[PDB]
Amino acid sequence: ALFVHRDTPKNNPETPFDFTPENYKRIEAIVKNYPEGHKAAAVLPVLDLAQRQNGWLPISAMNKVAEILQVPPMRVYEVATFYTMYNRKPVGKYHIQVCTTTPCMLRNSDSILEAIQKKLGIKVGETTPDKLFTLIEVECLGACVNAPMVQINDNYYEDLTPKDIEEIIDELKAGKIPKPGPRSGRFSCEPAGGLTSLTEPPKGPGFGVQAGL
């Protein structure tokens, strides 16, 4: 929760960090997306790559991003503390993110938050002692019509009930993988009582195209 750094024995510039050679090829592909002389524009992807290899960001991933992109290390520290995805502490293997903004709070996201809390035995901001689940509380995740919803590491779980989220936590503990979708009857975002629109077939190429084209 802090935005200063103190050197612990598990988080210091002598903590080992190095990319894999496939990650170096991915970094080179990232750097080739930006103009020559603006390599600093690859700070946000590569550092996110340093979170995908490691799960979090010690202060050796930030310095390695600062080293391979030829940017000052404070300019990577700023990015790593500005953005909310960069875990500057070691989070669990399944990082549960419950959206509790107003369109999800109107559809009772607190029930699912308390369901995860009493299911896992932790509260908001903590990690289960088997290092498998970190529960924090996030802002609007862009799934507002599928409210309420959570996010687990990449995957949205939508239209949730407390029974559905207990089922998802049970199959995360079981070593399987859950299905990232709305757990109600609908598929993505449609009205649940049938399609109120887009029921006709799509008209195909050349429909309504103006003349002189």
Binding site: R26, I30, N33, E36, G37, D154, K179
Partner: protein, 44 residues
């Protein structure tokens, strides 16, 4: 056979952690040569 009942977007069940970056690495060859500012960085 016209179908308006099945959700055809089942591919994102099969995405891993490096899927976006491997798609970027595959797309690295289809792209135009980047413009240059004339210097290696704004600190050069």
């Amino acid at each position: 056979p016209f179908d308006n009942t099945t959700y055809k977007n089942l591919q994102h069940h099969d995405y891993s952690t490096y899927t976006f970056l491997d798609l970027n690495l595959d797309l690295s060859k289809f792209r135009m040569p980047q413009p240059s500012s004339g210097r290696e960085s704004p600190r050069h």
